[PDB]
Paper text:
Proton-coupled Oligopeptide Transporters (POTs) of the Major Facilitator Superfamily (MFS) mediate the uptake of short di- and tripeptides in all phyla of life. The E. coli genome codes for four different POTs, known as Di- and tripeptide permeases A-D (DtpA-D). DtpA and B exhibit a prototypical substrate preference similar to the human PepT1 transporter, while DtpC and D have been classified as atypical POTs, because DtpC prefers dipeptides in particular those with a lysine residue in the second position. The DtpC structure revealed the expected and well-known MFS transporter fold, with twelve transmembrane helices (TMs) organized in two helical bundles and additional two TMs specific for the POT family (known as HA and HB domains).
DtpC in complex with the conformation specific nanobody 26 turned out to be more rigid and a significant fraction of the sample dimeric, allowing us to reconstruct DtpC to 2.7 Å resolution. Therefore, we performed a local refinement, focused on one copy of the membrane protein, which extended the resolution of the reconstruction to 2.7 Å and improved the accuracy of the atomic model for subsequent structural analysis. The peptide binding site of DtpC is exposed to the cytoplasmic side. In the case of the here described DtpC structure, the IF state is open. Tight closure of both bundles above the binding site is mediated by a salt bridge between D43 (TM2, N-bundle) and R294 (TM7, C-bundle) and hydrogen bonds between H37 (TM1, N-bundle) and D293 (TM7) as well as R28 (TM1) and N421 (TM11, C-bundle). In DtpC, the E1XXE2R motif, has evolved to Q1XXE2Y (where Q1 = N17, E2 = E20, Y=Y21). In DtpC, we now observe that the side chain pocket has a different architecture and characteristic in comparison with the one of canonical POTs. It displays an overall more acidic groove caused by the presence of the aspartate residue 392, conserved among atypical POTs. By replacing the phenyl group with a lysine side chain (generating the known DtpC dipeptide substrate Ala-Lys instead of Ala-Phe), we postulate a putative salt bridge between the carboxyl group of D392 and the ε-amino group of the lysine side chain. This observation, together with previous biochemical work allows us to hypothesize that the selectivity of DtpC for dipeptides with C-terminal lysine or arginine residues is caused by swapping a salt bridge between the recurrent carboxyl group of the peptide terminus and the transporter (R21Y mutation), to a side chain specific salt bridge with D392.
Numbering used by the authors: 1 to 471
Amino acid sequence: MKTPSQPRAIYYIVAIQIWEYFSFYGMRALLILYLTHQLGFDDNHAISLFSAYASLVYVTPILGGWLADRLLGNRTAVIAGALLMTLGHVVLGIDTNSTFSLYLALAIIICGYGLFKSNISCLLGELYDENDHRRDGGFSLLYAAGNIGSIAAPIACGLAAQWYGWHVGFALAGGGMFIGLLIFLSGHRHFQSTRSMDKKALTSVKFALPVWSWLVVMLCLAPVFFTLLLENDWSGYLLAIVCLIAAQIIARMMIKFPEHRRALWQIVLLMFVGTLFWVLAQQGGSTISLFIDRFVNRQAFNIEVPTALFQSVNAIAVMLAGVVLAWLASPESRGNSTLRVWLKFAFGLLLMACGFMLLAFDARHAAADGQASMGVMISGLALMGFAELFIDPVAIAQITRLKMSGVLTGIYMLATGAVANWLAGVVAQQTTESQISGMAIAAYQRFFSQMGEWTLACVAIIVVLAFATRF
């Protein structure tokens, strides 16, 4: 007999997954351009704020996962997260001229994203029995939904912003999130099997107060906390605490499972190298977006392409590459697995190097005309997108060889997200040592040349050690 179909609720989860990824990746395409053009931030300040936001959105999902586990259930937390992200995009759209509006909106979005990101996948995993064969198709479709939304959002938001200004771009992102929420809520009759909210826990009293009122207080104060954390650039102290906690978890883990201790060190070393990779990769939305805005010739068809659209190019490059390797998946995946892993990382770093070399070459030879060339930059972005398939999938495939691999996966994603984004913001300050003179193309040319050189240095070190340890 034919296999049973996917549980119909999947298609509503997919729908919200698209629209959330639409909103999140739309705002991300506009943000640094809005900070510079509308608000008149110096590049140092804009890059700092951007990287702080990009780290906190990788930090808060742990807290929202613990909240959905202990109190809310996954469905409630998904709904609340979508409401909060909608509210924050509406706040950002309604007033484009206060800066406090910006910080408040970003804090509200960070909270809603923290409630959403983990719990949407937990809710998808709740629909299947423990040995259901459909689960892999489910999660693959959810990943495809996220890729679709990541490709689609920078185009639509960029065009809407160009034609009507930043207000309508952010309003469009929020309307996307709201559409997705209404689609999800219309499917409620299919979710009746999923875990409801723990009414007994919420009606438990802790100190003088019922727990639900502590959630009300938290809903009020957490946006204030994150607003102050962003406005003062204090996110680094939180990131340091998170890193210290993760290090303690790993150390206790090293004691508890000494028969796997050396394997754990391999994962640690992977966490290091992948973090450095993502530092480079996170130049994509910050320094490279400013370079494209300022110094690339974007004229075509007697039209000018909005810089935000080039953020979609990366996503296309990732998705296409994902297909091709899937088209070419082959039984040669055997033998010295650790050496193969390290050579995959070396190849990804090499592709990242080539991307930065193409950007540096373009920014140098622009001097023949005065502006850089769209095709060489596009090629760099494409190569940088392709590089991403050889890092995180190989790392998670290596981690998932162990038990306890969910916590190590969480720690790996926390490092390569939050730490890599904060370090990317720190590194990007090297583009802006020449504040007094004004920005010039030579500063980006130096930055890209240095990034290429360091990438090839890391490639050489990895390859040399990996082969020297074979003999």
